[PDB]
Design a protein around this nucleic acid. Structure first.
Ligand code: MG
Ligand code: MG
Ligand code: MG
Ligand code: MG
Ligand code: MG
Ligand code: ZN
Ligand code: ZN
Lengths: 67, 33, 137, 100, 36, 49, 183
RNA sequence: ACGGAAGGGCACCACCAGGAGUGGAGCCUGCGGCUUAAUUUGACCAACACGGGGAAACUCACCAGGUCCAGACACAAUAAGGAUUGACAGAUUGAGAGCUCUUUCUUGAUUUUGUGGGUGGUGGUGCAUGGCCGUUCUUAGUUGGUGGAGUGAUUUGUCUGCUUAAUUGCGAUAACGAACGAGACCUUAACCUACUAAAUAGUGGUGCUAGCAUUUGCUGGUUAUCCACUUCUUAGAGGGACUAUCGGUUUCAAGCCGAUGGAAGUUUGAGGCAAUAACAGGUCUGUGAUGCCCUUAGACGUUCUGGGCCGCACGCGCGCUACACUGACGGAGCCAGCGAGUCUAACCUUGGCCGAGAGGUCUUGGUAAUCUUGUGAAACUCCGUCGUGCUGGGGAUAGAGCAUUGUAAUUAUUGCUCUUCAACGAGGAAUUCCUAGUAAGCGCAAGUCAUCAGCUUGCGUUGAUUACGUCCCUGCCCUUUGUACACACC
């Protein structure tokens, strides 16, 4: 399946907790900012984190999300 | 003679002055002080 | 200028040059590819847009690497991509897109090489997934 | 002057590039002319074997590999800039054969 | 079972490595010395 | 005392265990198929796939 | 050749590893580079033992005249303790405590066999954090399997030391799933 | 923990819709059975082309025989007129075996003899073990800190329900925050008119050029012949996918489903790695790993000859070849990839000549992206012969001859030539594998090798059918539940 694990979801939430006046809802300008504000040790995991952060901040404009 | 040849090719396996490691079928012999 | 085309393991390198309607495939002409049933599979990226449509270009393709059908698909992709590239560079990208529309609306891996590669076989059975026959008793 | 061909082979890609990149700059600091470093395809030495030390269990096969890598660089230089340059590549793990 | 009976208190050929101590065997026509 | 043993499975043995079966006569190993499984990483042979 | 030559060089390295493991065990040998935990029992009488070892390896391999955190060291040390006589649990506890206090981020010591003649249980001792399946096991995990030979059977000594990745000094320094953000 | 207790869930080692089959035929091979001097032995989902086990000698552990000590080392003796060693000429034996004898030479503190002690064993014990695998597991499960519930052992966290391949996540929620496992990771396979560098890779243009046509163009060779380049090839660093975007469905989300674009949208495809653990699962016949027992000088040690493992009233499994016209047979087209291949030397073999062929031969290149090799593979494609026949399908069985490998082909190693040409008219009850470059068909390389594939490990050529679901069957997991079990149903 295409379900994201905790090391994706929690890191994305931690990024959105302190970088909302930061990377927009676009994945291309999301992963780039992730590269400099996150010590991701693999581009695939970086892509996962940035995609889930893009999804989180895309649905943030439809109502607040838990946690 | 038949023993001198090997006792000088070097430079009884039990009495001493022969410490034998095997290390893959090669009988490493070394004497002692 | 130069393009390439692959289906499984064959590669067909095509050179498209300004010339007079010369379409060579192995030294022989395109009419002598000799699958003898896929000979109309190499006329696809010509018959598609305009039947003759072209006396200005020369396509010299050379294919090595796969099998009969794979190399026929490779050459039929190589001539197509060569035409597309030549139109994009020299003639105009408007017309390259106007023939790319036909190529993509007839897409049979003409422009995009097929991604299906031979999946590796695994121990305990002939074939990648097929397993040896098992007996309980 | 003498023309030579250096051949670099190893299993360790990191130190293989550590010498293939050291040699280029050690020839540029003396401003020589050389054909670029050519990378011969890696030989994958795959070798299948039986995991079982006996003949019981499910038939499960296990392959091993020692991928070997090799390059080659050709140039020309005097004898001192040949010997002092072949004495730079002693990285333990990368083997260097210099032919003339 | 080679015994070499006690051999209580006591010619030569070519191959001069033989030091005049290779006395032949006198059975009959035994021109094959002890060594050979 | 010994007849020729220059070929066949009896000619070669494991360089370590001297077992005449399963011998790996490839790339110049001359090692048993189990002794190699044991000392494979130490030669430079590893598992990736 | 070169493929055969590098295969033979690997075989030669394995021969050296096993020869020094059998010879310098009581000297605390860890691995050919050689690297031992003690570099005095090898030098011996101001070069005696080392020169004799070079002579033996040279004569065997047809050469010319001129041509703390170690898992294996810990396994050899605790095998030596078990062979001169000591409680199995006590030796494993000591080795695990030493490995955990010597900067390592995790240790595991398994002793299997006939401790006292029985069904040969497997006594494990695990302390700290320890990774499993993945390329990290090759990156930072050191394993040593030794055969202890007492008067009743054989004991299997397995030692796994996981070094702290942050003090890597070479290669990846964190875990693939380790993420640290700034603000 | 177990249950001949139950409920949910998952899986082409389960099913559904199907494909290929297997079981029906001949043969290959393994196992059993029977025989044998021996037909060595382990193994009974997770034994039965499995021990890498494709056994002529060796392997070998089996049997009929024959050798030999490779029995050290404190000794006690034999030993300084000699302890012991070997042996030609003949009996003797398969043996040019001094095994022993007919028998008289030789050497010379190495032995030989007995107390004592050792070494080796494919001898036993895998129910004494290590290590390694296999299985549970193509499974998701396991565990702290603080808090909550219990006097307590303990429990919750670790779950009703949706979702996922997943204890994956959402979510519900006395839990919160986490850790191992899963994932992440690594290897490989897809792409990149981007960087880098390449007569060990390739491409064009100048001369060297033979044809064809001759307004200069088609195919071309030009392996020391000219320059430029990196699209194809190669390999380093990087890039790229994160289900992107848009809609529908999502309880409120996790996600799922379509379309667009994308190289790649099912964990992107395939693997490696794989937690706490349980097995009296297999392996002492891998180990100079090893406890105990046994054997140790007429040996169960080692070695030589020969035979056996292959033996045939029969049963079983994994397979190869077929039953044919979608085919056989001939010419013709000439289409890969994974690899391997010799310096103390005979490995991969290119190119000539001979033979019908295997093969022989004189060479050559290759220690290798350089030569085999462009592995000019096979299936397949074209045209013809066959005409539907137990046939020209099938090649089982057997006869004769030639070579190769090997000290040695008899019980045919294998190859080649000719010849009789068996069953088989598509397979019963049952039963196995599998969801896309996958099934199936096809052959090639590598391993085992002096020789030998019907075996295995990888590889590519051709490329479908059906399905995108489920708990009807089987297997497994979780939960609940009962226990007089706790060495835990042996
Ligand atoms: Mg994983
Ligand atoms: Mg075999
Ligand atoms: Mg024996
Ligand atoms: Mg609990
Ligand atoms: Mg057999
Ligand atoms: Zn003489
Ligand atoms: Zn071995």
């Amino acid at each position: 399946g295409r379900v994201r694990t905790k090391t994706v979801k929690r890191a994305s939430k931690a990024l959105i907790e302190r970088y909302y006046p930061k990377l927009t809802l676009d994945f291309q300008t999301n992963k780039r900012l992730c590269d400099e504000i996150a010590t991701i040790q693999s581009k695939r995991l970086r892509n996962k984190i940035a995609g889930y952060t893009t999804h989180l901040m895309k649905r943030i404009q439809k109502g607040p999300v838990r946690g | 003679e038949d023993r001198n040849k090997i006792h000088q090719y070097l430079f009884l396996t039990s009495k001493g002055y022969v410490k034998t490691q095997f290390s893959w079928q090669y009988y490493y012999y070394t004497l002692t002080e | 200028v130069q393009t390439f085309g692959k289906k499984k393991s064959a590669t067909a390198v095509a050179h498209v040059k300004a010339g007079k309607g010369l379409i060579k495939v192995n030294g022989s002409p395109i009419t002598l590819v000799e699958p003898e049933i896929l000979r109309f599979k190499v006329y696809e990226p010509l018959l598609l847009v305009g039947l003759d449509k072209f006396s200005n270009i020369d396509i010299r393709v050379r294919v090595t690497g796969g099998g009969h059908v794979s190399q026929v698909y490779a050459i039929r992709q190589a001539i197509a991509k060569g035409l597309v590239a030549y139109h994009q560079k020299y003639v105009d990208e408007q017309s390259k897109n106007e023939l790319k529309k036909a190529f993509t609306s007839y897409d049979r891996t003409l422009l995009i090489a097929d991604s299906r590669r031979p999946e590796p076989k695994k121990f305990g059975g002939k074939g990648a997934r097929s397993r040896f026959q098992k007996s309980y008793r | 002057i003498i023309k030579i061909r250096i051949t670099l082979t190893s299993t360790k890609v990191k130190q293989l590039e550590n010498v293939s990149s050291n040699i280029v700059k050690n020839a540029e600091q003396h401003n020589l002319v050389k054909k670029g470093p050519v990378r011969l395809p890696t030989k994958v030495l795959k070798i299948s074997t039986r995991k079982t030390p006996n003949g019981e269990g499910s038939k499960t096969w296990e392959t091993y590999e020692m991928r070997i890598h090799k390059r080659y660089i050709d140039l020309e230089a005097p004898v001192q800039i040949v010997k002092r340059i072949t004495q730079i590549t002693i990285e333990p793990g990368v083997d260097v054969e210099v032919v003339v | 079972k080679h015994k070499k009976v006690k051999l209580a208190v006591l010619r030569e050929c070519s191959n001069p490595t033989c030091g005049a101590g290779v006395f032949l065997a006198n059975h009959k026509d035994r021109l094959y010395c002890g060594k050979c | 005392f010994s007849h020729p043993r220059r070929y066949g499975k009896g000619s070669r043995q494991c360089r370590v265990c001297s077992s005449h079966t399963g011998l790996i006569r490839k790339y110049g190993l001359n090692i048993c198929r189990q002794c190699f499984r044991e000392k494979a990483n130490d030669i430079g042979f590893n598992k990736f796939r | 050749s070169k493929k055969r030559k590098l295969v033979a060089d690997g075989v030669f390295y394995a021969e050296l590893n096993e020869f020094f493991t059998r010879e310098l065990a009581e000297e605390g040998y860890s691995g050919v580079e050689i690297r031992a935990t003690r570099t005095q029992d090898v030098l011996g009488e101001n070069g005696r033992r080392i020169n004799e070892l070079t002579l033996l390896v040279q004569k065997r391999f047809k050469y010319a005249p001129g041509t703390g955190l170690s898992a294996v060291a810990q396994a050899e040390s605790m095998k030596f303790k078990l062979l001169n006589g000591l409680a199995i649990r006590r030796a494993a506890y000591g080795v695990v405590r030493y490995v955990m206090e010597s900067g390592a981020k995790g240790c595991e010591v398994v002793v299997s066999g006939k401790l006292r003649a029985a069904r040969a249980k497997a006594m494990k001792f695990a302390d700290g954090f320890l990774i499993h399946s993945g390329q990290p096991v090759n990156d930072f995990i050191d394993t040593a399997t030794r055969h202890v030979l007492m008067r009743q059977g054989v004991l299997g000594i397995k030692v796994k030391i996981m070094r702290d990745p942050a003090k890597s000094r070479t290669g990846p320094k964190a875990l693939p799933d380790a993420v640290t953000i700034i603000e």
